[PDB]
Amino acid sequence: SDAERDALNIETAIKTKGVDEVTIVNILTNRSNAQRQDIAFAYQRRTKKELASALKSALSGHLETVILGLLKTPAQYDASELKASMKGLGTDEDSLIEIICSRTNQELQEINRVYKEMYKTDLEKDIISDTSGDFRKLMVALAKGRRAEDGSVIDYELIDQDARDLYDAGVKRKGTDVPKWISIMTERSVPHLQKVFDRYKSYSPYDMLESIRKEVKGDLENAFLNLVQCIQNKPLYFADRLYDSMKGKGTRDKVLIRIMASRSEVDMLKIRSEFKRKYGKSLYYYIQQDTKGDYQKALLYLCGGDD
DNA sequence: GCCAGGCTGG
DNA sequence: GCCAGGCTGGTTATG
Ligand SMILES: [Ca+2]
Ligand SMILES: [Ca+2]
Ligand SMILES: [Ca+2]
Ligand SMILES: [Ca+2]
Ligand SMILES: [Ca+2]
Ligand SMILES: [Ca+2]
Ligand SMILES: [Ca+2]
Ligand SMILES: [Mg+2]
């Protein structure tokens, strides 16, 4: 890599009359996150100005959102998105749910650490302040990032007991024992819960997702639905969330940008494979139909190719 | 989950 | 009939 050559080409594009957005996109969306950190360092040393601030002046619109997000480290970006989801008197529960429900223990440990560094308060405290009831209990538990790690031994006895407990806490009874659902679904390892959800189908006339829809409502329902999909098949979860961000009128750009940026370097090949298999056309194609301009170009580079 | 009703398959 | 799935609504499950 040549961070200083990239940093120089970016400054030229910034200072150019009208701004050369294509140069900025072509560079930043075709570099790894670590290469971008080096570019930003090299840029500050050359210009005495922060790259992120210089681009926030030089860009606007959805393109600005993409590019500024790409400049943050993965944990910084996640922490900033969590902060933004909680900003003001409301809560963006959909975004909070997406991040907390899909991040691994190791990702969440770094988010907790980085959040506190950037905002001087614990993530858990902001979550407690923005949520209430069982939804709060579930989000706070997940955010600890202390799910059991995948053991070397499959515990079939516990798989069966957990399935019965989920059934007895929900569909089988009047009302719902939500704390039993929260315990099992936050504490057990991911491969364990995968097996629990199939075993659950032996006891229950409905699968886990349909049981959630029948038993709970609102933010709690949304959160359990996202979590179960994340446990069952996380690349498919992101493929479905991307399809949902585009399928209808307009675009849920906040969701589309965040997924494309945060997964580009993690599992985007699997996301693309699941998307193409389910929807028959490529993720690339859906992005092309829903977005335009340099913004489109940036997302297509994060996609990484057709099919 | 319970009690039913009609429906589509093999 | 039997086997496997679905969808409705009424009287509704440690209720
Ligand atoms: Ca321009
Ligand atoms: Ca701007
Ligand atoms: Ca708030
Ligand atoms: Ca809200
Ligand atoms: Ca119930
Ligand atoms: Ca519901
Ligand atoms: Ca659309
Ligand atoms: Mg790439």
Numbering used by the authors: 33 to 339
Paper text:
Annexin A2 is a non-EF-hand calcium-binding protein that is characterized by the ability to bind and aggregate (i.e. ‘annex’) anionic phospholipid membranes. AnxA2 preferentially binds to phospholipids and other anionic polymers and does not contain any canonical RNA- or DNA-binding motifs. Importantly, AnxA2 was shown to bind phosphorothioate oligonucleotides and has been implicated in the release of PS ASOs from endo-lysosomal compartments in productive ASO cellular trafficking. In the present study, we co-crystallized the C-terminal domain (CTD) core of AnxA2 with a PS 2′-MOE DNA gapmer ASO and found that unique hydrophobic interactions between PS groups and lysine and arginine residues account for the enhanced affinity of PS ASO to the protein surface.
From our crystallization trials, we obtained two types of AnxA2–ASO co-crystals that were used to solve two structures referred to as structure I and structure II, determined at 1.9 and 2.4 Å resolution, respectively. The asymmetric unit of structure I contains one AnxA2 protomer and two chains of ASO. For one DNA strand, all 15 nucleotides were clearly visible, whereas for the second strand, 10 nucleotides could be built in the model. Unexpectedly, partial complementarity of the ASO region that encompasses nucleotides 2–10 promoted intermolecular base pairing. As a result, two strands form a largely ordered duplex in the structure. The key interaction is formed between loop IIIAB (the convex surface of AnxA2) and the phosphorothioate between nucleotides dT14 and dG15 close to the 3′ end of the DNA. This part of the ASO adopts a distorted conformation that allows the phosphorothioate linkage to interact with a pocket on the surface of the protein that is created by R205 and K206. The interaction is primarily mediated by contacts between the backbone and aliphatic parts of both amino acid side chains that make van der Waals contacts with the PS group. Closer inspection of the binding site clearly demonstrates that the interactions with lysine and arginine residues in this structure would only be possible when the non-bridging sulfur is in the Rp position of the PS stereoisomer. Distinct electron density from the calculated difference map was clearly visible around the phosphorus atom and Rp non-bridging atom in the inspected PS linkage, which unambiguously confirmed that only this PS stereoisomer is bound at this site.
